[PDB]
Amino acid sequence: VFPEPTADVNYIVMLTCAVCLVTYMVMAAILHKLDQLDASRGRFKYEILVKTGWGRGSGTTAHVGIMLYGVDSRSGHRHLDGDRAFHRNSLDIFRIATPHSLGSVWKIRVWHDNKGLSPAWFLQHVIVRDLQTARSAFFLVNDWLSVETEANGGLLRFRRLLVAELQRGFFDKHIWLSIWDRPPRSRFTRIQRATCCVLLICLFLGANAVWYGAVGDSAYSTGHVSRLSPLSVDTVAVGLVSSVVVYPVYLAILFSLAHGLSLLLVAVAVAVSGWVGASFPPGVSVAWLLSSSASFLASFLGWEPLKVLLFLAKEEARKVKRLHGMLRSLLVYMLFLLVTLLASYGDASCHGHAYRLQSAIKQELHSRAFLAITRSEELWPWMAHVLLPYVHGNQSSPELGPPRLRQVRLQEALYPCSAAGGFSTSDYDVGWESPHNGSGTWAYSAPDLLGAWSWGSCAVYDSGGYVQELGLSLEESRDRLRFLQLHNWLDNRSRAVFLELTRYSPAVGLHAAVTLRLEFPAAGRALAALSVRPFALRRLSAGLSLPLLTSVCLLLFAVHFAVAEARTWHREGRWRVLRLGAWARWLLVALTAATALVRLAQLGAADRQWTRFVRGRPRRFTSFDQVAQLSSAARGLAASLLFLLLVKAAQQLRFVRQWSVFGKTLCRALPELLGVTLGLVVLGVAYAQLAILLVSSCVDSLWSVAQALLVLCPGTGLSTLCPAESWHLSPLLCVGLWALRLWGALRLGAVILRWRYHALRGELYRP
Amino acid sequence: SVLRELVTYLLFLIVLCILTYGMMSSNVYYYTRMMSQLFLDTPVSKTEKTNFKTLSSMEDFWKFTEGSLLDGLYWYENLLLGVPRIRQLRVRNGSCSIPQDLRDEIKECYDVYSVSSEDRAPFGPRNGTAWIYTSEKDLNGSSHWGIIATYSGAGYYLDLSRTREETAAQVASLKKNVWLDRGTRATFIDFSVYNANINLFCVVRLLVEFPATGGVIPSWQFQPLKLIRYVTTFDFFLAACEIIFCFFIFYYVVEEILEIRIHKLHYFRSFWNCLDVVIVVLSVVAIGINIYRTSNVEVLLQFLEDQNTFPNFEHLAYWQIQFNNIAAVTVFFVWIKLFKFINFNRTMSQLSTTMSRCAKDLFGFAIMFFIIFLAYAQLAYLVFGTQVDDFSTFQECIFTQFRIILGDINFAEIEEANRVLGPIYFTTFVFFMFFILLNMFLAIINDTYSEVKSDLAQQ
Amino acid sequence: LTYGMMSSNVYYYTRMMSQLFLDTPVSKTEKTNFKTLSSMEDFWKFTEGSLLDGLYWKMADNRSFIFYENLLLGVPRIRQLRVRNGSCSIPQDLRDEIKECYDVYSVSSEDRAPFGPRNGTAWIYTSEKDLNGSSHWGIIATYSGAGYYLDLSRTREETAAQVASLKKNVWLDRGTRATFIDFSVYNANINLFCVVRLLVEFPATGGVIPSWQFQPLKLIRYVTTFDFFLAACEIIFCFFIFYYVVEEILEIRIHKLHYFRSFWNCLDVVIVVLSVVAIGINIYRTSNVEVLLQFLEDQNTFPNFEHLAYWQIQFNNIAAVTVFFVWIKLFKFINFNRTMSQLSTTMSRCAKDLFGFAIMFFIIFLAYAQLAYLVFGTQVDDFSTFQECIFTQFRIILGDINFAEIEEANRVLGPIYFTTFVFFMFFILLNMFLAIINDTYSEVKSDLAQQ
Amino acid sequence: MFFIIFLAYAQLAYLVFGTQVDDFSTFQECIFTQFRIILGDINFAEIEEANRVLGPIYFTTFVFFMFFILLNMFLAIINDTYSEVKSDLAQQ
């Protein structure tokens, strides 16, 4: 099978492959670090006397250790050498540097070493009662045995032989949980395990993509992918067969220079994954991802137990501990990065088509001819010219519902943006207020519960107002518009018009929410606003779409971080201030929770509104503006989360020894930069006030000296300034910042940073 | 210790901020656009596109003075406030010395405008006052300081009427008997408006300069005035703020005279005391201008109903301009004095000591920088002075050099005017400003900062 | 060699043609030109209007000299691409409200059936092989070399009739995705061909996107003595490249088997690879002028000079990059005193630290770029793609931006993005580079002075 | 060295854009355009459509190397020389 003649791109597979490769590279580097650290060197242990002089006759070079076969620590016997080096008729009394720690249970084992003559002395044990953890006992058999025969005990039957074997090898060849549980000097280099695990995960994903993309017609022909609801029937039997078919080939390498022959396999596997997995619809891609995840989980829980049945010393120990902590943090943080990338970048082609579609829609509605208006009566010919033919003409084949037009009365019509009060709520008959039989022919049409707050220029509205259906066909629409025109509809009160219909585009699969709104500050004056929000109508009821999976993963990450940080926050109690720290963690959890909540809200709103529209098509409006706004908010929150994670990635680069100076320099120079920032803010405020006071006094005859030194925000010249409705703050801030930049005044940071960097570099290499 | 001093100064600062905010939003600047656009942007007639902004001859000016002027002066919807006046200044025939090499064809010569060459003889039909000389004293006039020359207050004037039916007739009469000969060198038009729709005043001045080389150079200036009275509560708040500011500056000058009385031996060796004295002198001149305009704004309401007498209202506009320009620099200096006071922590102490210990060196290098700057400006004036229109005058050359430093270069006409020595000048100027000279300030600051940090560390 | 190729002003040759075709209004009343097409009717006005006026000039059906000097070679050809009706997926909830659907352009979705008055070659699909074409890579997508083509006439009176007949029997439906126009001119006064291509893309969402391509070529090289001099220089350059190849091969054979940690050997191999690629392209494009011979046999046909122009452009790009790197290699010899030696040592010793800081600088740069792409991407027109975001940020560094447009798109998170970007780029990132450079320069100068 | 790099960039710009921009039509015009680039007085709507690749690469690399490397090197030389001269004259 050779599918996908088209040249579309599925970003899921390439993004996951890139994340996996980067994780492999950084883990390989850190494991090479750990490799050379461990090679440079290669509480159960007590610090009491171990003198056993109750026997003799065993004078020989003997040096054996003990095995603390307990919980959280599985280490074998070690070796040591003293002054006498175990001379004749001498028993060594010393301690070993064994980092294994045992508990208060019957878990203790000691080995023996008899090189040459058999042992004759009886060394009972090391006399210790309570030194660090009291994980030893001053009593043993102390009986002679054969060569290299260690006496058993607590604090040959098969029921005791293989039971103890499941404690020293259970954390030895448990491939997933073996990078941080490797015994000293095991001939696997601790990186071939990483190589094999990355090989196998690559194979798992690759085989799943091949099955979902190429071999999908033999058994389930004519659309094999038809199931998305998780009911333990889908994606549960999918990764199992892949694991079964690619696990023996793993056993071929696990039993060498297999890394050189395995990098080629990784390359070809990722190439195939990018080749066949590119033509995946959203359901197929999420099904593939869940199948791979299920395969990994089953291998970690079902296949791993299957084959297992068959003084600076404290400084080095804490170094090892923090290295393992860094590895765990790296894995969890990179999984979070993958999740947030899949949450953010799922609609890239959608994004480009959205820009192009909104631009086309804007130019087809005469945006320039609508915003640049100054006559409030040319709007009727405008809508009868460029709106009705747009809606009902053959140019717009997809419509998705009729338009609507709702106006607010406000009930205190102004006398010729200010001087506003409350809003009308009552009903009015044909013409205006005239209740004869029942309710007004122009009813209030109470605002909907969800979807409102357009947040205009000098007002904030809602979804309520006296609506007009504008008919369905062109002929009745003209009659309705002339009726409203010459029947006193907008004549008297005229708060707002709120024209909105919809837009669909099946070629790109996007909807667009188009809104036309006029605000009337005073009678005989009008200003117009245009907004076009394109979005994809993805529903909650559609099944197991990628947004849902990414959102639930993000919520799990949020609760994980919340509990992990609150655990330390509650231990400290109060007075946990003066650092970014916990506050930064609160910011992170707030962002990663809002991202999921807004996405779920968007999905639910989309589903509810689509069902409401399907109820009656040519009957209502259904108002997809709420869905568009929720989509935009979710996109912004995801972008902010990805920004924060990328900044954290940049910060975490300090672990290179020669590159650790930049972060320290910035952190130590922060107070001086803060002082200079305060001075610059004062100077910029003074400059902005001077500039505004000089520029807002006359036309073209301002002055001669100042305008040769007067700096404004880029893109706006010296001609059009001073907007007579509101003195906006953001352009003033831009003017201040750019005048600060252009007059120098931002290179004093260089003055401070040079001194700080030169001081830091002199304390890093010289000592 | 300095808590009250800081407190008094902070109180003084908020008063200035409130006054500026009250002054920043007078809703006048919109009005001055929409009042200047009536005269300087409306075509003379339905046929031609020419307007006062783009005058180019004498015939179009004659068209303008009967038309786009009367059309916009009698019909936003401002109205008249008296009688306007038209005046001209002119030179006399035979003011030159034509070279004897070619005199058989050049019979008449008129020099550029000057007091020595000004014409005083009665020209044309001596029927009215526009055909006879009246001195500067008899017109209560002053200098104007135009574009190509400075003009006195004398000349040949004629006050127009209040009804367009007669103003058009008299301007047509002045056009018939040729009034703008070859010797005419300038022409002024002035009047005043009310615009009863919104309570706000304005005085206008329109100038047309006739160079000796042919053509016209149109110039204009619009300056509104305010007749603010007790209308709303915000006005009362602003007036109370102005009064308390007057009392506060009175107290401040009392403390200043005390300071100069007890510490008269040394008061100009510090940079801040000079700031205080310039602030107080700017404040006193600003309040003097304010009280002068407040006293003199009541005189002008006599012309609102009907008076056939030209109102001389140019000094008010001049002093309003000066008042605004003084207020701007005053508030800037007050904010800098605020910038002085931040010396609380050790970090700000180090920053302030660094900025204070490198003042003489920065001033010393300013001299070299400006020597090079003015050498380049003089080169640009001598090369592009006749062609580019951005370098036509020395101060305009300096302004263009400052704009170029801020990246507002044109380089189109610079290269067109002189294909060589123009590009050379531009490239050398950019290279030396942006890479070499402007980095000496930073070098001085950096070395001073290093010295200050080392001195404190060893202390 | 390179500046002989960049000979006397051909810029005016290109400018005359581009001004004649792109900037000429489509008709006397309308102000629309080819650069500002907005719909299909604009394209039909342009084809019957400014195109025919700019193509055919007057003096039996004689040739047309475009500026009385540029000779129109043969006939021009117009070609379009289409997609199939019902080539997408439409929801089942609207299958009675929406009837017809056309996907975006793809080789798997293109129409291949006869349509309309199926008489000539304008209404019948012709393969890429049968058209001797190739892929174009327009703005939206990479189009094919096939489609529905028509060959125009040698006179105005017949091309006008052909285009009118194409317009009556509707030739541009909603399925149209592109339209090409090709022709070539000679201008014998100098020896230089010009190959023109005009492309108009119709995106699936509506609208029109025009583009153009004017390329001068020289295909009859050996005419004057300067051409013989250039040929001799070409031979000399090939000899130099052979000598450099053999020298670097013998110096990498045994001595210094690694050979790559010098940055001058790397520059040498980069120059050699670019030079041999340029030589190969030149050999395999000049040796194939068989299209010119085919045209010269019969000059009433369409001259197929598209691949020649494409390979000329590729050769120009390679030559420009090679000249850049050869000029950069001049730093290997400017060590005649101590002042240049210490500066070169400073740069060499600061590269290792500036790379480490530039990693962080570019990570933050890309974080800002992706945030801008995700937030302002659908609205601003300057952030529509990731590369455009990077270009816009580099322009913002220069101050070449319009803050009003990025503020209107999002009144909050627009000003925050702009202000924070400017502040942190100019106050923090631009000064750490200075700190590192100054520290390393002072260190090396002091070390040399002390020793 | 600054001018060696500057002239290399000018030569590349002349060879790439020299036929279609009007700001790179001659070598001297290429040099003038570059000094004008530093001031942010460019279009980039005609550089990018003249050559979609190798045009943006040109602009990005030129901006990066002008602003982040060579300007800081000039300032470093000036700073170090000023400090050394002041220290030596003061101590002598």
Ligand SMILES: CCCCCCCCCCCCCCCC(=O)OC[C@H](COP(=O)(O)O[C@@H]1[C@H](O)[C@@H](O)[C@@H](OP(=O)(O)O)[C@@H](O)[C@H]1O)OC(=O)CCCCCCCCCCCCCCC
């Ligand atoms: C999220 C939403 C997105 C929206 C847009 C949001 C935009 C946000 C853009 C971010 C750019 C990141 C830079 C690179 C980070 C790095 O590369 O590095 C970070 C570095 C981390 O430091 P680090 O991890 O390496 O190492 C430490 C180092 O060992 C010792 O500092 C330690 O302590 P010490 O021994 O000193 O006691 C300890 O701090 C360690 O953590 O720190 C630091 O704070 C960095 C300090 C920055 C300097 C700010 C100056 C504000 C001016 C006032 C501002 C007012 C300005 C506004 C005016 C408009």
